[PDB]
Design a protein around this nucleic acid. Structure first.
Lengths: 35, 225, 138, 30, 365, 114, 415
RNA sequence: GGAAGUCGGCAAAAUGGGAAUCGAUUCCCACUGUCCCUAUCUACUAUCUAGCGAAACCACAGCCUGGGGAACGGGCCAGGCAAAAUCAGCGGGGUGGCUUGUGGCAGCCAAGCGCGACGUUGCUGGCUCUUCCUAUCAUACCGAAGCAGAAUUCGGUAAGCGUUGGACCCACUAAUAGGGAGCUGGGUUCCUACUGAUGAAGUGUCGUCGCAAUGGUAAUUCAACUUAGUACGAGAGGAACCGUUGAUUCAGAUCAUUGGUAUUUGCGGCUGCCUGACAAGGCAAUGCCGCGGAGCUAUCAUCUGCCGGAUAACGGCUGAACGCCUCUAAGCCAGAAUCCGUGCCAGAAAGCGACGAUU
RNA sequence: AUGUGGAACGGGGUAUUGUAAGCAGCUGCUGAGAUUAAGCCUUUGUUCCCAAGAUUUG
């Protein structure tokens, strides 16, 4: 099985970070940031 | 008669239990199994996505009919509360303090008559008659104690081992007041209960069930109309 | 393929208490009485580590005492009970008072018909056939 | 850096052995 | 001649030297990358390991073997009283690294942070920061100049904050002072946020929010000098090389546990912090009889999964994760069902004395 | 999530605490701590072990019955449909158990003192 | 008999290169003259032995994977007769086995002489003398290895037949509608072209009827193809499906087809033939009809009419030769079957899933389907424990009444 | 769990014993830390201190790499390097540029200079251990093949990471690939290194908070759910990518829960002993037994293990050389578990910055 | 180096064991008694002690 150094695994991990899967962290940061 | 597979397993009786008033499906796996059951019984009876004791063998752990449902001792309070909320009011639920926890393996019960493991407790038999409102009879199937797993019951038909004799066939039919046929499910597997779940108007078997076997179940269960 | 053959679900890590050379009770009605552990499926490359099994694991078993025709096959066996205490993932610690198991084919349906004694739910979940043919599942 | 697998510099026995056996090769072809 | 029977290496070459950490407080060797798209927010906090317990939570993990079941997990309780911001440090990027250009301190420094500057507070004449206080009162235009310097030249803004160790039931009186990098916004925005946060307390309620994934960093427990057996896991003419396992220090090393989940951030002023929607039963996070070797938790606390480095009453640093990692374990919510506060000093059997008293008879005392 | 009762001491058994033992007759025993588990292993009768609630209640050292509030508790094997009004007033009935049981606990020991 | 599992046979050069490369790469390579003579002898002995082991390992793989013509069902044995000349195939396989034994003999001989090697050189040439003889042995079966590879390639193409199961052999004149009947009956995509004898070899196709599966084997029309067709019906418990061109649109005369069927009747005996009138839409036949076993079924090949009736008749002939009130809900009597394409079809949780992130991401709400006096509380958390007691033990629809009765009682005790 | 250890029941536990064959051997039962797999407890030593106080050994000493014809060595050559004084451990240090994958005899040619190359034809030692190499068994990615699918064969880059448990045998495993540089059996009659621990010292002094040159580096494999009984296949059979869940091995932590440990000699019980007696306690080289907090600990318990560039095999774009063509010559794109960083550990005790006070 | 100061005891909580001696009449006092930090928590409790000696520092 491909490891974590895999360039593919890095690529779709980047794809996850490119979409709303990290938008739950943006608004999460904004909540404390505003309060 | 329909063909379905829970995950990639030919045993759907183990992972689900079906009656004439409700359906129970395993939780946490693929709901494709829940999707298939809803496709045929969603508009008829409620379908409950339930587990029993944090376990997916609810089909062989719980035995019930169109009237009542039974759960073993290991059933958690949260799951029992979940089942009560899901099922409609005219259906009653009962915990059983039975040593033989596998209710689905020790009790094969239709709406009117149930045949039970020979060594069942008297208190279990009394509460079964009270809740299920069926006549209870202690007998073995083909010399084998697990009646619920080795025999499938419906209102109009039933199946047993191909190993049973003709006189045992006649005696079982006479004691059950329902047509009974010696057959097999899932291409030669003699666990009829584990491979077949049947209500009074539809039947589900594993996808590996042969066409001849499906014709046999359809013939005995009169489901063409 | 025997390794996770017809498991219908993953197993959680469980305390290992039945290594090889173990002698343990037959739990089915097929006629066998005692089993001897020869090897366990799914053991990797660990230096000096004795292969071990838990509840619901599939092992290679030899019927030391039992019916002669039941013997002369290194048959797959499912460990259904274990004396060593193990942590169920919900938190409770469980241990049956004897080490028990069933003679099964490589596919995962046993030669027996009814199980005498309690059955671990981990065993009953990786092996729906054992759950189907179990009498009391705990 | 050498950037090689085999060293370009030679040992004194090795360099002396060439003149030992190169001369014998001329003796043999003669 | 080759090795006949091979095995993986008995140790890890990435953690040596196995020497004693040159620090007692957990160092942050990496702060999360900054971004001007997001304005101001902090990135770290400092707490004390009070003790650890176990909880029961309903696991909503889609696709899991135990989806929608009740699960038991060990949890670590870290008391996190609010920390007072007393300084700001500007860091300028140079071809030689990040260099601290200047530092600005708040006018009123508590004895908590003043004790950090002395090895013996009682003998000292307490002369630290006195002339700084004098010049702060006299002329604020000077201090405005260093802040102008920070917002004009510096690229990284960090705030010096000290923990109110007085609030904790610790016998230590020195406050732990560290730098938390202000991530987000322009350098001017960070400088302003530092200014309006001078001398005020920043609490864990504003730093972390009960669901995110953090890195917990600290110094591990000390096991003393140990032989090759327990230090390393051990079962041609040359000189001994560094790779050979040897006998020496085992324990008290700086470690970093990644991917720790906060199951709960409770408030000290609230008396329901140990109670959940499935439990009621008014109780506090402190176990019956008090935490073993720590005391009673009376301030804000954080409940992490698993175990964290170091023994009880040691200081831990909690930082935001450097890299986003959207594993569904890191993204799922947590709904606590029950928290264990029985006596950890022995085989405890009762959650609170109130509910112990009905079961037990009328004690003569 | 059930706070069971130990077989030996008859005390509460919370999640995580204690041991579960399954016998060949499929009977499940729960032990709160190592003391009760090992005492069960040595097979010491709870009715003859002094510090057990089983001994205290079977030796006359604990109340014969407490029909507190016309109903005190039971192992209900028929689940009941979830209601707020039922769920809130039974939350109150919980407490009303506790003071009443606490009151009778004081009265009984005061009677036993003389 | 699935002949696809035979490993591909390299030509003599690649075989030698693979063997020698494996010997070089897997065995140690460096030796010095100053080493003990035992180590030198062992060094070269390993290479000779390792090369022997690689060669037999490959040669045995061939000898085991090929089917033993004698031990197999005579249908396939005779089919391999007509296609491959069992004697040539048997000679080719025996040559490899004789080679295998020769490779073993040379290696045993040279290992034996190596025990007496006195210098690094005399061992070196025994090894060179060894491997060369091993190689020259292999080079002599160039024809045998090439032949077996060609046989292998065509074997992998043959259909997997099973005479044990019920069958119905279809044979007749070339392009006389038999291919059309096979295509209409079975799912097999048999190519139909104007070129005669388009079906060079046999074509096996399964068909499900009468709750059973029958393997219809179409044979070449009637040469090697004709011989293979004859052997197909030679040993098979099946019925003939002869198709005679009624209108002669296939290019073959009806009288000629009848004469051919009469001549082939000796091999078609013990079977229920069919007197198919092919190309119905598009005298001599009296003698064929006099047999009786042939079923005269019209086959309108142009109009594709009667093919299903003929197939059903042939299948039937082959088979012959070989108080409990079920209160079904009213909604069940008018339930629309869940078929995806229709718009009236309701939704399923499977479709909610693919919309809401698919498998492993969608969290099914278990509580979403509770029979309950409200849909809002549908996410509430029911208290389970309170002050050492479960809330569950006390959930009673009349629990308020027990509390008021009680109130009165406590008010009595305080007074 | 019960000899799975070892050449082997060496030693302990069963109290040693039951049956066979010639005291020995075997077998079945029995027992157990020999082992999986180590953990805990006690005493002594080692540690420090007061006093006393040696000996062996000693040309001089003390870092490594390549070379010094040899004998390479520590002194010599060329490099890496190199900062006082020390402490506790552990014992390391006291002969071809060979070689590899393709046998021996005869003849026919015949590029060419009597030979004559390739061809062509004729015949019969094992138990544990650090690191390195690739000449790759598995894992990653590619090319070819009757490669429909699945499974597979060969070949290329590739040494990052694994390559077991038992008596050639039989299992597991993804695989059980090949080699280089403390110990025991049958067979012949000081100093230096390594590992931890202090430590004087510029920078005025003492501190607090930091920076980061450099050195080390870590994660590995499997199967489970859909995607599927779909692509493909007459059928038999039947995958993949995205997404998700567990487990094997390894690594780093931790002691809520569970087990273990008992000098808490904490409590209790039993035997014997000690004052006239009811009692009262106390004693027995840790008298014996049960429980036993705290601590320690267990893949016997729990937790945690991540992303950016540059490439190799290889697939392409434009495009000449060579008016065509061309992945290459100038340039460019995609591309492997690979290399380099990030992250993680250490912090130059002769690298540094900011701040505080300053007799 | 006079303080939300420290220390020695004491109380309480929490734990370990199992219901003490005695008073008595197995039972009651008595889930009692004993131990509880030596690397458990707490203290409007009492008592006690510290605003000292030496050394190195531009």
């Amino acid at each position: 099985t491909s490891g974590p150094r895999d360039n593919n695994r890095n690529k779709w991990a980047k794809k996850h970070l490119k979409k709303g899967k990290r938008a739950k962290n943006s608004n999460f940061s904004k909540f404390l940031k505003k309060k | 008669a329909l063909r379905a597979q829970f995950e990639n397993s030919n045993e759907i009786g183990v992972f689900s239990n079906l009656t004439n008033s409700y359906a129970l499906v395993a939780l946490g796996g693929s709901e494709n199994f829940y999707s298939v059951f809803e496709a045929e019984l969603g508009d008829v009876v409620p379908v409950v996505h339930t587990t029993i004791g944090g376990t997916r063998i609810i089909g062989r752990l719980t035995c019930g009919n169109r009237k009542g449902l039974l759960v073993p001792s290991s059933t958690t309070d949260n799951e029992l509360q979940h089942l009560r909320n899901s099922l409609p009011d005219p259906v009653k639920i009962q915990r059983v303090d039975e040593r033989l926890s596998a209710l689905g393996n020790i009790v094969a019960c239709n709406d009117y008559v149930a045949l039970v493991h020979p060594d069942i407790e008297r208190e279990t038999e009394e509460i079964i008659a009270d809740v299920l409102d069926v006549e209870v009879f202690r007998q073995t199937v083909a010399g084998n104690v697990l009646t619920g797993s080795y025999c499938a019951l419906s209102n109009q038909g039933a199946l047993v081992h191909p190993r049973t004799s003709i006189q045992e066939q006649d005696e079982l039919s006479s004691l059950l007041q329902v047509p009974l046929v010696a057959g097999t499910i899932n291409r030669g597997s003699d666990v009829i209960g584990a491979g077949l779940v049947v209500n009074d108007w539809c039947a589900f078997a594993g996808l590996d069930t042969t066409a001849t076997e499906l014709a046999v179940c359809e013939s005995i269960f009169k489901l063409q109309d | 393929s025997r390794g996770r053959g017809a498991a219908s679900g993953t197993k959680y890590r469980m305390t290992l208490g039945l290594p090889v050379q173990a002698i343990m009770n037959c739990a089915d009605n097929s006629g066998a009485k005692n089993l001897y552990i020869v090897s366990v499926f799914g053991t990797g490359a660990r230096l000096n580590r004795l292969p071990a099994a838990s509840c619901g694991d599939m092992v290679l078993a030899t019927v030391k005492k039992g019916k002669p025709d039941l013997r002369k096959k290194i048959m797959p066996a499912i460990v259904v009970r274990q004396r060593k205490a193990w942590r169920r993932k919900d938190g409770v610690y469980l241990y049956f008072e004897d080490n028990a198991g069933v003679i099964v084919n490589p596919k995962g349906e046993m030669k027996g018909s009814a199980i005498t004694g309690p059955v671990a739910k981990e065993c009953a979940d990786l092996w729906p056939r054992i759950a189907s043919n179990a009498g009391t599942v705990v | 850096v050498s950037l090689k697998k085999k060293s370009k510099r030679r040992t004194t026995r090795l360099r002396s052995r060439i003149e030992k056996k190169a001369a014998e090769s001329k003796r043999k072809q003669k | 001649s080759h090795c006949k029977f091979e095995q993986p290496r008995h140790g890890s070459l990435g953690f040596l030297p196995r020497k004693r950490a040159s620090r007692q407080r957990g160092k942050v060797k990496a702060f999360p990358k900054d971004d001007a798209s997001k304005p101001v927010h902090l990135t770290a906090f400092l707490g004390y390991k009070a003790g650890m317990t176990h909880i029961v939570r309903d696991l909503d993990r889609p696709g899991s073997k135990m989806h929608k079941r009740e699960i038991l997990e060990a949890v670590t309780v870290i008391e996190t009283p609010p920390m007072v911001v007393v300084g700001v440090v500007g860091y300028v990027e140079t071809p030689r690294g990040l260099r601290s250009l200047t530092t600005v301190w708040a006018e009123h420094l508590s004895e908590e942070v003043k004790r950090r500057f002395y090895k013996n507070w009682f003998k000292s004449k307490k002369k630290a920061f006195t002339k700084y206080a004098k010049k702060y009162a006299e002329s604020t235009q000077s201090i405005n100049r260093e802040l102008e310097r920070i917002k004009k030249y510096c690229s990284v803004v960090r705030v010096l904050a000290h923990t109110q160790i007085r609030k904790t039931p610790l016998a230590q009186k020195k406050a732990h002072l560290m730098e938390i990098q202000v991530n987000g916004g322009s350098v001017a925005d960070k400088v302003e946020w530092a200014r309006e946060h001078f001398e005020k307390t920043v609490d864990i309620k504003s730093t972390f929010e009960q669901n995110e994934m953090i890195d917990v960093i600290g110094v591990t427990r000390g096991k003393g000098n140990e032989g090759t057996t327990a230090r390393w896991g051990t079962k041609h003419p040359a000189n001994v090389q560094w790779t050979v396992a040897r006998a020496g220090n085992a324990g008290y090393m700086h470690r970093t546990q990644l991917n720790s989940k906060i199951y709960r951030i409770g408030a000290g002023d609230d008396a329901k912090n140990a109670s959940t929607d499935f439990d009621a039963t008014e109780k506090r996070i402190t176990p019956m009889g008090g935490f073993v070797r720590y005391g009673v938790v009376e301030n804000d606390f954080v409940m992490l999964n698993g175990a964290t480095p170091g023994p009880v009453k040691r200081v831990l640093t909690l930082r935001k994760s450097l890299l986003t990692h959207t594993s569904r374990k890191a993204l799922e919510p947590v709904s606590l069902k029950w928290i264990d506060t029985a006596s950890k000093f022995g085989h405890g059997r009762f959650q609170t004395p109130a509910e112990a008293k009905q079961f037990l008879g009328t004690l003569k005392k | 999530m059930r706070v069971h009762t130990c077989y030996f001491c008859s005390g509460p058994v919370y999640p995580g605490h204690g041991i579960m033992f399954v016998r060949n007759d499929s009977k499940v025993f729960r032990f709160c701590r190592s003391k009760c588990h090992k005492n069960f292993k040595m097979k010491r009768n709870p009715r003859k072990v002094a510090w057990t609630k089983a001994y205290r209640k079977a030796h006359g050292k604990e109340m014969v019955y407490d029909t507190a509030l016309a109903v005190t508790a039971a192992r209900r094997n028929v689940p009941v449909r979830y209601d707020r009004n039922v769920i809130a007033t039974t939350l109150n009935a919980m407490k009303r158990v506790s003071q009443v049981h606490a009151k009778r606990e004081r009265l009984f020991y005061k009677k036993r003192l003389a | 008999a699935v002949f696809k599992n035979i490993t591909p046979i390299p030509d003599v050069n690649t075989f030698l290169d693979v063997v020698l490369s494996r010997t070089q790469r897997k065995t140690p390579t460096v030796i010095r003259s100053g080493f003990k003579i035992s180590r030198i002898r062992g060094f070269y002995g390993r290479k000779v032995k390792f090369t022997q082991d690689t060669i037999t390992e490959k040669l045995d793989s061939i000898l085991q994977e090929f089917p033993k013509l004698n031990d197999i069902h005579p249908f396939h044995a005779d089919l391999l007769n007509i296609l491959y000349d069992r004697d040539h195939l048997k000679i080719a396989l025996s040559q490899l086995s004789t080679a295998k034994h020769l490779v073993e003999n040379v290696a045993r001989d040279y290992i034996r002489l190596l025990k007496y090697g006195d210098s690094l050189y005399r061992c070196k040439q025994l090894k060179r003398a060894a491997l060369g003889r091993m190689a020259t042995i292999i080079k002599r079966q160039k024809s045998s290895l090439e032949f077996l590879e060609q046989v292998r390639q065509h074997l992998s193409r043959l259909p997997a037949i099973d005479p044990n199961t019920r069958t119905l052999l279809v044979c007749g004149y070339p392009n006389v509608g038999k291919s059309s009947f096979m295509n209409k009956v079975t799912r097999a995509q048999v190519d139909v072209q104007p070129y005669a004898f388009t079906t060079k070899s046999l074509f096996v196709g399964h068909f499900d009827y009468k709750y059973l599966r029958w393997q219809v084997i179409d044979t070449p029309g009637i040469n090697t193809i004709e011989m293979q067709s004859i052997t197909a019906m030679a040993h098979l418990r099946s019925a003939v499906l002869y198709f005679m061109d009624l209108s002669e649109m296939c290019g073959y005369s009806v009288a000629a087809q009848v004469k051919l069927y009469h001549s082939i009747k000796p091999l078609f005996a013990n079977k229920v033939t069919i007197l198919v009138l092919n190309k119905i839409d598009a005298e001599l036949l009296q003698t064929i009809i006099d047999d009786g076993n042939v079923k005269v079924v019209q086959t309108s090949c142009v109009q594709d009419i009667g093919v299903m009736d003929v197939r059903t008749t042939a299948c039937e002939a082959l088979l012959a030769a070989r108080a409990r009130p079920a209160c079904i809900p009213d909604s069940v009597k008018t339930r629309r079957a869940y078929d995806a394409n229709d718009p009236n079809r309701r939704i399923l949780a499977r479709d909610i899933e693919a919309a809401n992130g698919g498998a492993g991401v969608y969290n099914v709400e278990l509580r979403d389907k509770y029979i309950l006096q409200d849909p809002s509380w549908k996410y509430d958390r029911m208290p389970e424990l309170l002050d050492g007691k479960n809330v569950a033990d006390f959930v009673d629809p009349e629990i308020e009444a027990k509390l008021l009765a009680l109130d009165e009682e406590e008010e009595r005790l305080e007074r």
